[PDB]
Amino acid sequence: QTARAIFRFVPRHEDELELEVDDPLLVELQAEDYWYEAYNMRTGARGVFPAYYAIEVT
Amino acid sequence: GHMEQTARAIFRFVPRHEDELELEVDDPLLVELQAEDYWYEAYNMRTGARGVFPAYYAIEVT
Ligand SMILES: OC[C@H]1O[C@H](O[C@H]2O[C@H](CO)[C@@H](O)[C@H](O)[C@H]2O)[C@H](O)[C@@H](O)[C@@H]1O
């Protein structure tokens, strides 16, 4: 699934992904807690973030 | 200065990390914005829990 960061996200935890507004992401929703596992296509970084910081694109 | 403020959870937040604060929608919170990453240090006034959450998941009410 592809998505776009709708808000800036600065990690507090090492497993997290830094997001800038409008970063294109490849994304798997983790249904147990509504975090995304993500790849930031701008930065090449991989990590998790809380799902409400991005929206799915089609 | 980012002074303490009253807030409400606008989204459900389930921790992945031990230092995090569980939110339910419309939880009243006492909140101090941490400027280095825009996480809130927070007290959940419903649950009595202490912890951090990302700022987008609540709205200031003061
Ligand atoms: O006497 C302790 C400090 O009290 C104030 O700080 C608290 O209250 C503030 C106003 O609501 C908050 O912004 C802050 O988060 C609290 O620590 C005061 O501002 C400080 O100068 C005092 O040292």
Numbering used by the authors:
A (entry chain AAA): 491 to 548
B (entry chain BBB): 487 to 548
What does the article say, verbatim?
Aromatic residues cluster in the core of folded proteins, where they stabilize the structure through multiple interactions. NMR studies in the 1970s demonstrated that aromatic side chains can undergo ring flips—that is, 180° rotations of the χ2 dihedral angle (Cβ–Cγ axis)—even when engaged in stabilizing interactions in the hydrophobic core. Here we capture ring flipping events of a buried tyrosine residue in the SH3 domain of the JNK-interacting protein 1 (JIP1). Our data therefore suggest that the conformation of the aromatic ring at position 526 is determined by steric interactions dictated by the size of the surrounding amino acids.
Accordingly, we designed four different mutants of JIP1-SH3 (H493A, V517A, V517L and A541L) and obtained their high-resolution structures by X-ray crystallography. Of note, three mutants (H493A, V517A and A541L) induce a staggered conformation of Y526, with χ2 dihedral angles ranging from −41° to −75°, whereas V517L shows an eclipsed conformation of Y526 and an almost identical structure to the wild-type protein. The H493A and V517A variants show almost identical crystal structures and for a subset of residues, the chemical shifts of which are unaffected by the mutations, the resonances of the two variants fall on a straight line together with the resonances of the wild-type protein. This suggests that they are in fast–intermediate exchange between two conformations represented by the crystal structures of the wild-type protein and of the H493A/V517A variants. In agreement with this, both variants show line broadening and chemical exchange contributions as detected by 15N and 1HN relaxation dispersion. Analysis of these data shows that the structural features of the minor state of the wild-type protein are captured by the H493A/V517A crystal structures, as shown by the excellent agreement between the ΔδCPMG values for the wild-type protein and the two variants. In addition, the analysis yields exchange rates between the staggered (canonical β-strand) and the eclipsed (classic β-bulge) conformation of kEX = 2,830 ± 70 s−1 (H493A) and kEX = 6,800 ± 300 s−1 (V517A), compared to kEX = 2,600 ± 70 s−1 determined for the wild-type protein. Finally, the observable chemical shifts of the two variants, in conjunction with analysis of the relaxation dispersion data (Supplementary Discussion), show that the H493A mutation slightly stabilizes the minor state relatively to the major state, whereas the V517A mutation almost inverts the relative populations of the major and minor states.
